């Protein structure tokens, strides 16, 4: 299987 | 602000 | 299996 | 700000 | 199996 | 700020 | 198996 | 600030 | 098995 | 600041 | 087995 | 500051 | 087996 | 400051 | 077996 | 300051 996730939260 | 992300998942 | 995740939180 | 991330998962 | 994760939190 | 990360996991 | 993780927290 | 990290895990 | 992890926390 | 880390785990 | 970990904390 | 670390574990 | 770990804490 | 470390564990 | 660890703490 | 360490454990 393959998984790709990106998260760039900003405050 | 600036954001750059690349994801090339392969199975 | 394969897993790829990126997180760049900013405050 | 600037963000750069790359992910190329392979199974 | 394979795992790849990156986290660059900023305050 | 600047962030650069690369991940190429292989199974 | 293989594992790769990177974390560069900043305060 | 600047951050650079590379990870190429192989199974 | 193989394991690779990097952490460069900053205050 | 500057950070540079590379990891190429192999199984 | 194989293990590789690096940590460069800064205050 | 500057940080440089490389790890190539093999199984 | 094989083990490799590096830690360079700074205050 | 400056830090340089390399680790190539083999199994 | 084989083991390799390095630690250079700074205050 | 400056730090340089290398470790190539073999099994």
Task: Tell me the residues of chain I between 1 and 11 that have a Cβ less than 8 Å away from chain L.
Answer: 1-4, 6, 8, 10
Please, is L6 exposed, middle or buried when counting C-beta atoms within 10 Å of its C-beta (0-12, 13-18, 19+)?
Answer: buried
| K1 DSSP β-pair partners | none
Give the integer Cα–Cα distance in Å for K3 and J8: 11
CB K1 to CB M4 under 8 A? no
| M7 DSSP β-pair partners | K7, O7
Experimental method: NMR
On the CB side of M9, CA atoms within 13 Å amount to 4
Distances (CA, A) of H4 to C1, D6, G4, J8, N10: 26, 11, 15, 15, 25
- Chain C contact partners (≥3 CB pairs within 8 A): A, B, D, E, F
Neighbours of E9 (CB within 10 A): 16
What is the residue-wise DSSP string for I1-11?
-EEEEEE--B-
**A10: distance to nearest CA of chain D, Å?**
10
Contact criterion met (CB below 8 Å) for D10 and B10: yes
- Chain J contact partners (≥3 CB pairs within 8 A): G, H, I, K, L
CB D9 to CB A3 under 8 A? yes
Residue with tokens 């680790």: N7
């Amino acid at each position: 299987y393959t998984i790709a996730a990106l998260l760039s939260p900003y405050s």
